[PDB]
Write an enzyme that holds these catalytic residues in place. Structure first.
Site, mmCIF file in Angstrom:
data_model
loop_
_atom_site.group_PDB
_atom_site.id
_atom_site.type_symbol
_atom_site.label_atom_id
_atom_site.label_comp_id
_atom_site.label_asym_id
_atom_site.label_seq_id
_atom_site.Cartn_x
_atom_site.Cartn_y
_atom_site.Cartn_z
ATOM 1 N N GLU A 1 0.828 -1.204 0.000
ATOM 2 C CA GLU A 1 0.000 0.000 0.000
ATOM 3 C C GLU A 1 0.858 1.249 0.000
ATOM 4 O O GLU A 1 0.662 2.156 0.810
ATOM 5 C CB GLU A 1 -0.961 -0.001 1.195
ATOM 6 C CG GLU A 1 -1.926 -1.200 1.187
ATOM 7 C CD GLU A 1 -3.100 -1.041 2.138
ATOM 8 O OE1 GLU A 1 -3.113 -0.087 2.953
ATOM 9 O OE2 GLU A 1 -4.007 -1.897 2.079
ATOM 10 N N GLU B 1 -3.674 -8.951 -0.060
ATOM 11 C CA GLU B 1 -4.243 -8.754 1.275
ATOM 12 C C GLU B 1 -5.758 -8.905 1.226
ATOM 13 O O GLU B 1 -6.437 -8.210 0.461
ATOM 14 C CB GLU B 1 -3.847 -7.384 1.846
ATOM 15 C CG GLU B 1 -3.807 -7.359 3.375
ATOM 16 C CD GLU B 1 -3.223 -6.070 3.949
ATOM 17 O OE1 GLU B 1 -2.015 -5.796 3.758
ATOM 18 O OE2 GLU B 1 -3.970 -5.342 4.614
#
Ligand SMILES: [Mg+2]
Ligand SMILES: [Mg+2]
Ligand SMILES: [Mg+2]
Ligand SMILES: [Mg+2]
Ligand SMILES: [Mg+2]
Ligand code: NA
Ligand code: NA
Ligand code: NI
Lengths: 855, 283, 283
Positions: free
Chosen positions: A426, A512
């Site tokens: 991220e 994820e």
């Protein structure tokens, strides 16, 4: 050590007999410094976990302080090591380490998760007293989760001849393994040999491949290289080829390991012997049908795992780590993503030996700090390394990011468990400013990784793919053009489909997934008051999905290679939905200080969703598990005082029964059968299709009955496709739940009743609170006190409850949802450990642990 | 001289007076009495006798107690294998404490030696040139048996050194012995008389420091007394000296007249001992 | 209680802790395993069986060596005549060590007893109610033959006790056995499971102290574990206990429902042993 001499092993344990001080004012690098009032400690060591919680800290990192810690060790180097080389190796220090030896500053190392080293040779006093000093500065805020502070991984010394294989100096490739499998297999090796003597050496290598543990009599291939002159003070890469005679493959079910030994000869005599661990295996990622191992399609059934070990804090204890992998393997897990930073070497070792696939991630943020964490690695990633900084482990000519990435790859390049390098997570999330520079930074990391190791695909986990950012599209194409694999964070079914349509060339996976948030043992509500969350699978964060949904979306799609569910185990910090990224407590104090994300709590006690995953993932066991616990004061009553009863199972058909309190006769409540689905690639899964099926498709991966409340027993029977009973001895999970009495007894059991007497090994002791007839009381919170006698000591107590602020080093703790844990560690003398668990008004329980001397 | 670690290269005494006056370097002390390490060298160097020597002496007030009141027991031997025994005070029966076997090493030039390579060997390699057991203290006797590589016993009459140590009683008696009971009447020749202090049963009391007085009469003169104790500043030309660690020595020199020498060693509260040295003439 | 000679009549522990906490007075220990003297009494008292018993166990690390490395061997028997033999380890040939014969004695009332009146009899009369031989230690088997007054052998099948002792190997396996293999399912009745720690050939290892763990499954439950050792403070309610002198026991109790009890004895490094106990309904 207390003394270093011949002949310890080439690489030896340096964990013992350190001294520690927490002070941001002391200056204790001089060998003559008086440290007589300092604590004596053995490493690994975490000095955050011993300090108190405080509202002045951050919820993100468990409300625990960091600080400046100093470590000193004084030890003798005997005269018999006089012309040898000596280095000290750190598998990790969090963070901002500074190292001195006998008063001389050697260098520094910012990143808290990468391994590094320092040569000690030039400053050593041979035949004297020596002092190594490590200053550690975890200045907060440096992390989005609980980091811990200090030397939280093992430390070793390496002693070698002047002529020697370099640090992490062997690389092995088997580029034609898939074709050569079962016959002669070509191994292409490269070995860095250093001549740190004052004369040229005539060097030949004798390299041998043999079964781990394991003698050279059983080698399957050897080679001796032609003589190469390496000049005094120089080093050289020495290429060699080994023909391996039908090696046994490293697979999940049979993780065969070999030792690859390198003997360095100069003239006629061996001067150095270097071993590295290796496994024979190959992988593939395909855009249309996903992942394969050794030519066989395999679904990546994965979890994300943060580094800490619960009540032990950040300490990378090998058994603690091994126990996590064991509990995960029981769930059907076959892969781990090391979110979001290199793992301890100990995890790599355990996964090599157990047959777990590792996606090793190196970085969280890149050159932009996250969540207001001004002291995180974001501040360091792009800085240069001073010329007089002698730190070792990776490339030093560009930035820290290059150093730490290559340092990590250098350590694990030969590990069969590691299948991919993950370069970020991220990267563009929680930061400030433009993201126009992120594609170039990504391409740079991708180029460095390719040049460091051509044998594995690189990847990352990106959460802006689902938002269709231009930067993400560009970054994705760049991975792909370099034989990488694209990990998308938190896409649902429709988005997986969009990516696949929009980017036909990408090989993709769920890097994820889920982020379901549940507590252990919570039933009086089924949806997302008391700082706890439901244990039913109907609670997830806004960007996430419940467990059944994130799996349903992956299992139907052959082009989604797998999933890394967030998370396998609860971890300290990020206590979402009570999280906070700045200073101050959330909700009333004591505030939740650890995660709710985990399938298994911090104590290693499974939540109910564990058995859903097991029913989906483990083809080596059967599963039959019922929730909720059946006490009136813990259940939820809907319409008509009807309780939602949930069964997780891999059976074809389930019969559900009820037995009234005091009766021995059961009556039938319900009966349901699953339907087998098969994908194009051949994966199978089960869904319920009866006419009373849930309107939400993914919830039909399990079974629900609405059952009127009444005291007694709910129980289930499982049947296969041929209507043959699946007996209880072949099945895991609670196949019955019953109304319990009041708490009357403790019941303790140790996971291993014989352990190694090495001052390291652990025994985990689960204590249940039960009624007179041994049923675990579901809401029991009785305070349990442990008395440990004999050759060991209590190093932790835990119950996995997020708002519990009691010290992990106490000898007592409240149970939570009927369970409490104690952790006992051995000493260095063989003996026996006696542990008694006690609670007021309850019967006590005792376990007996033997400890065995090191061979 | 050179009484390192109490040495001094200029003037002035080192530590309180009387300060150590002679060396501690010697395998054998000044009086010619062997220290325990003497038998380590013997196990390593002398191919013409066998060695089986035990330390420490076995009285409660001289031993060291480590972890678990365990006393470090050390054995010097050239034998292939040793069995270690314990005999309770007042008993006639021994029990097997332990058993350890050496491994034989050979160099390129043919030289051979022995090192212990068992599982409980010392982590420091050179300490395995001898054997060590940790034994809980208890009044009685520690004894040893030695075996060759054919597991054949090596008898006591073929072995030097203390193959047993035992809990002694209080000092009871002197035991004198001349190394040579006939010497030349040339005014030069010497006889060395070793005096031991033992309990009622002839066991040397390991910390005895009884002052022993020598009475010499006949065809000879006392020319020295010694105990090898570094801090002992008593005159070498006196007729009396404290014993040290159970032993004291007297030296007597002949005259140029053939005859006999009578030497009596006395100590207070102790049974006295006498020897007699004859001196032969020269043609 | 009353753990004389470590007994105490007030508060506080005797000797180092864990302190002896049951008696030593018993002919049979707390677990119901007989001590050696049991077979002496049997030889004196039971006229319905014959007795031929030898002590000690014959391992080097458990025997007592007197003069000449001779071990006192004792035989308890009601036979008229005993022949004592030795069989060297590795042989199948036994040699005669000795032979002794009892004399019968009769009181006025007509009670009879036996005493040894040989020329090598003990100077203390009562010690002649049994037989002693001093025997040099050596690996192998000491065995005994019993004869009646007519010189006719007394076969093993009519005799109780250990009529041989043999040098064992290292501990290798457990051997479990239940005294009653069928008990009543009333929730009261018991089955006593003796476990022996033996070598590969089935000989009880005389100093075996391996911790044995019991797995109980079926229509019963574990209610006691014991080894009869006085200083052992391990809970009697645990599912494990060290053996003492090669032996350990589990007590299991039935339930009120008829079924089958399964009991598995385990220990680290050793083969396990499993027994099955039937439980049968009350009529
Ligand atoms: Mg853990
Ligand atoms: Mg299954
Ligand atoms: Mg001078
Ligand atoms: Mg009383
Ligand atoms: Mg009889
Ligand atoms: Na869930
Ligand atoms: Na010799
Ligand atoms: Ni923050």
């Amino acid at each position: 050590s207390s003394a270093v001499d011949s002949k310890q092993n080439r690489t030896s344990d340096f964990d013992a007999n350190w001294k520690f001080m927490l002070s941001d004012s002391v200056q204790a690098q001089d060998p003559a410094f008086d440290d007589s009032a300092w604590q004596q400690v053995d490493l690994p060591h975490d000095y955050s976990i011993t300090q108190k919680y405080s509202q002045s800290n951050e919820a993100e990192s468990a409300y625990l302080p960091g600080g400046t810690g100093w470590y000193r060790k004084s030890f003798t180097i005997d005269r018999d090591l006089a012309g040898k080389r000596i280095a000290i190796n750190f598998d990790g220090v969090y963070m901002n380490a500074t190292v001195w030896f006998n008063g001389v500053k050697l260098g520094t190392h910012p990143y808290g998760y990468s391994p590094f080293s320092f040569d000690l040779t030039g400053n050593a006093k041979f035949g004297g007293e020596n002092t190594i000093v490590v200053k550690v500065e975890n200045r907060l805020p440096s992390s989005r989760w609980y980091s811990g502070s200090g030397i939280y991984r093992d430390v070793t010394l390496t002693v070698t001849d002047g002529v020697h294989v370099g640090n992490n100096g062997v690389a092995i490739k088997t580029p034609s393994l898939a074709t050569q499998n079962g016959g002669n297999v070509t191994m292409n090796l490269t070995t860095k040999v250093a001549n740190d003597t004052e004369a040229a050496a005539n060097i030949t290598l004798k390299q041998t491949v043999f079964p781990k543990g394991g003698k050279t009599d059983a080698a399957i291939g050897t080679v001796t290289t032609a003589s190469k002159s390496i000049a005094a003070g120089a080093s050289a890469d020495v290429t060699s080829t080994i023909t391996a005679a039908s090696p046994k493959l490293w697979s999940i079910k049979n993780p065969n390991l070999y030792t690859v030994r390198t003997e360095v000869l100069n003239g006629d005599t061996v001067l150095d012997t270097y071993d590295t661990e290796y496994g024979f295996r190959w992988t593939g990622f395909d855009a249309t049908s996903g992942f394969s191992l050794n030519g066989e399609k395999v679904k990546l059934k994965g979890v994300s795992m943060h580094h800490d070990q619960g009540s032990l804090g950040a300490v990378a204890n090998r058994r603690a780590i091994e126990r996590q992998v064991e509990i995960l393997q029981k769930m059907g897990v076959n892969s781990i993503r090391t979110t979001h930073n290199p793992a301890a070497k100990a995890l790599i070792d355990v996964c090599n030996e157990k047959g777990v696939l590792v996606v090793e991630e190196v970085f969280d943020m890149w050159n932009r700090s996250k969540n207001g964490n001004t002291e995180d690695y974001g501040k360091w990633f792009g800085q240069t390394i001073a010329g007089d900084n002698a730190v070792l482990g990776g490339d030093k000519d560009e930035t820290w990011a290059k150093f730490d990435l290559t340092s990590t790859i250098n350590r694990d390049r030969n590990a069969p468990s590691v299948i991919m390098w993950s370069l970020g997570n991220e990267m563009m999330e929680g930061i400030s400013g433009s993201v126009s520079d992120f594609p170039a930074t990504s391409a740079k990391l991708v180029a460095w990784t390719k040049a460091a190791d051509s044998t594995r695909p690189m990847t990352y986990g990106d959460n802006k793919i689902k938002a269709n950012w231009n930067e993400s599209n560009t970054m994705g194409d760049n991975l792909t053009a370099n034989g990488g694999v694209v990990g998308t964070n938190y896409s649902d079914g429709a988005n997986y489909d969009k990516i696949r349509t929009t980017h036909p060339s990408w090989a993709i996976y769920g890097s994820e997934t889920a982020s379901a948030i549940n507590s252990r043992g919570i039933y009086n509500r089924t949806t997302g008051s008391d700082k706890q969350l439901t244990s039913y699978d109907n609670s997830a964060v806004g960007w996430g999905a419940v467990a059944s949904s994130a799996w349903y979306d992956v299992v139907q799609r052959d082009f989604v290679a797998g999933t890394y569910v967030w998370t396998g185990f609860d971890y300290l910090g990020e206590p979402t939905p009570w999280n906070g990224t700045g200073s101050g407590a959330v909700g009333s104090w004591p505030s939740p200080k650890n995660s709710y994300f985990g399938i298994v709590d911090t104590a290693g006690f499974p939540k109910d969703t564990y058995y859903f995953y097991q029913s989906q993932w483990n083809d080596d066991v059967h599963t039959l598990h019922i929730l909720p616990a059946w006490n009136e004061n813990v259940v939820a009553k809907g319409s008509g005082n009807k309780v939602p009863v949930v069964v997780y199972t891999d059976a074809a058909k389930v019969k559900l029964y009820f037995t009234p309190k005091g009766s021995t006769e059961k009556r039938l409540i319900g009966e349901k059968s699953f339907t087998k689905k098969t994908t194009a690639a051949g994966y199978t899964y089960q869904v319920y299709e009866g006419t009373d099926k849930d309107s939400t498709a993914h919830k039909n991966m399990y079974l629900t009955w609405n059952v009127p409340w009444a005291e007694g027993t709910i129980s289930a029977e499982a049947y296969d496709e041929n209507n043959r009973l699946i007996p209880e001895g072949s099945t895991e999970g609670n196949a019955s739940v019953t109304t319990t009495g009041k708490a009357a007894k403790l019941k303790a059991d140790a996971d291993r009743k014989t352990i190694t007497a090495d001052g390291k090994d652990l025994s985990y002791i689960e204590v249940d609170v039960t009624d007179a007839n041994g049923h675990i009381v579901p809401d029991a919170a009785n305070r349990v006190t442990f008395d440990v006698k004999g050759a060991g000591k209590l190093v932790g107590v835990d119950n996995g409850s997020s708002p519990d602020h009691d010290s992990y080093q106490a000898d007592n703790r409240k149970a939570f949802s009927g369970k409490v844990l104690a952790i006992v560690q051995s000493t260095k003398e063989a003996g026996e450990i006696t542990v008694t668990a006690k609670a007021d008004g309850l019967q006590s329980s005792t376990v007996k642990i033997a400890t065995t001397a090191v061979p």
